[PDB]
Amino acid sequence: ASRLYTLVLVLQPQRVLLGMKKRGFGAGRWNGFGGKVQEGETIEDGARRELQEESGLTVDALHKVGQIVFEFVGEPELMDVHVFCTDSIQGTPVESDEMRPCWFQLDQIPFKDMWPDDSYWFPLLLQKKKFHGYFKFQGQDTILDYTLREVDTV
Numbered sequence: 001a002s003r004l005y006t007l008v009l010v011l012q013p014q015r016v017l018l019g020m021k022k023r024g025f026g027a028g029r030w031n032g033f034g035g036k037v038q039e040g041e042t043i044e045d046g047a048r049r050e051l052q053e054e055s056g057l058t059v060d061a062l063h064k065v066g067q068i069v070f071e072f073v074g075e076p077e078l079m080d081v082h083v084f085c086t087d088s089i090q091g092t093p094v095e096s097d098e099m100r101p102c103w104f105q106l107d108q109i110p111f112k113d114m115w116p117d118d119s120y121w122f123p124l125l126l127q128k129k130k131f132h133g134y135f136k137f138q139g140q141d142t143i144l145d146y147t148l149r150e151v152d153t154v
């Protein structure tokens with residue numbers, strides 16, 4: 001029982017793009033861009049679609065950097081999150097109903113206003129290492145269990 005999601009990180013030499021989630025699940029946290037993958041689109045299609053919906057940005061190339069599985073206690077579907085990075089973007093990011101985008105210096109990541117699991121796996125993304133992760137949550141604050149490792153193939 002799993003469902004595909006995407007997560008897109010615009011990572012440039014000295015800054016990373018994040019959006020403050022305005023509504024929905026996990027609102028009030030700085031997030032990457034992404035969401036559910038729809039029927040009839042590839043995972044990467046879905047990633048590019050969510051990026052454009054949430055920020056207006058398009059990209060020449062997205063690169064697979066990771067995969068994270070989330071379990072929430074009592075919820076039947078696991079989240080199968082495919083994580084992507086890009087450096088070159090096309091456009092200037094703008095606010096959507098869902099996300100307010102801002103750039104952050106790579107030593108000023110707002111981990112305290114981000115999902116707790118970000119503190120574990122995001123530095124690996126910043127270090128340009130591919131990774132597989134698993135995080136078990138009870139609610140949105142408490143990691144009950146996790147595994148994390150670098151991988152050669154995402």
Ligand SMILES: NNC(=O)c1cnc2ccc(F)cc2c1N
Nearest residue numbers: 007026030031032070115117118
């Ligand atoms: N940049 N990080 C995210 O956007 C992010 C990180 N962890 C999560 C864990 C569970 C979940 F439902 C969402 C996220 C998430 N969006």
